[PDB]
Amino acid sequence: YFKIYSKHTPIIGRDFPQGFSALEPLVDLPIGINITRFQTLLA
Amino acid sequence: FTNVYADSFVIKGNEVSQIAPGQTGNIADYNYKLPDDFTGCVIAWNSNKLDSKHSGNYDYWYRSFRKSKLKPFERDISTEIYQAGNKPCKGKGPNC
Amino acid sequence: ATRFASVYAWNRTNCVADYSVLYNFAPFFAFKCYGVSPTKLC
Numbered sequence A: 001y002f003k004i005y006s007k008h009t010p011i012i013g014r015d016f017p018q019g020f021s022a023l024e025p026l027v028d029l030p031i032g033i034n035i036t037r038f039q040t041l042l043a
Numbered sequence B: 001f002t003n004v005y006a007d008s009f010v011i012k013g014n015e016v017s018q019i020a021p022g023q024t025g026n027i028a029d030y031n032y033k034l035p036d037d038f039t040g041c042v043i044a045w046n047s048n049k050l051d052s053k054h055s056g057n058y059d060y061w062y063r064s065f066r067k068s069k070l071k072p073f074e075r076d077i078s079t080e081i082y083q084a085g086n087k088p089c090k091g092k093g094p095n096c
Numbered sequence C: 001a002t003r004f005a006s007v008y009a010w011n012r013t014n015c016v017a018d019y020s021v022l023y024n025f026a027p028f029f030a031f032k033c034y035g036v037s038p039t040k041l042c
């Protein structure tokens, strides 16, 4: 079940903050695909 | 319910006993594996009066060959040729 | 078979049975199985 969890952390400009934050559930889409591989989509 | 799904399909009478957790056979293994930890209801009824044809209704297909068993709620509609023998044949083949 | 036999030749089978040899002997025009198709498993 393609479970998507996320968080926007608009706080640490330079790079990985090292900060402690936590992601929240968003959606659990019932796709049922084996999804061995994936790729990005860029504008 | 919280998140409920209704799965609609047509099976043979001798396969009704396979749509249950823990079952094996051509349906449980190659068409649809139901999770062993399963919550829900399986409702089945005879449709001979609706689906059968005198000449035979061939619209309904059953998968008989696959290279592995399915995981819970997995669906695979690929029609790629399966090799039943040792030769790596393509297309309809001597052991394909 | 040297000569093919009619339905009377119902041959009884204490022998280990390997079904891959059947596919090694010849390809088949059709192969159906109520039991699982790879088989070779009492």
Ligand SMILES: *[C@@H]1O[C@H](CO)[C@@H](O[C@@H]2O[C@H](CO)[C@@H](O)[C@H](O)[C@H]2NC(C)=O)[C@H](O)[C@H]1NC(C)=O
Pocket: A034, A036, B067, B068, B069, B070, B071, B074
């Ligand atoms: C999910 O995909 C992987 C490959 O992306 C499948 O793994 C292959 O399975 C076949 C048999 O079905 C093997 O012959 C391959 O060697 C396997 N390859 C790898 C890399 O594992 C996997 O079976 C798929 N999941 C399901 C449930 O079929």
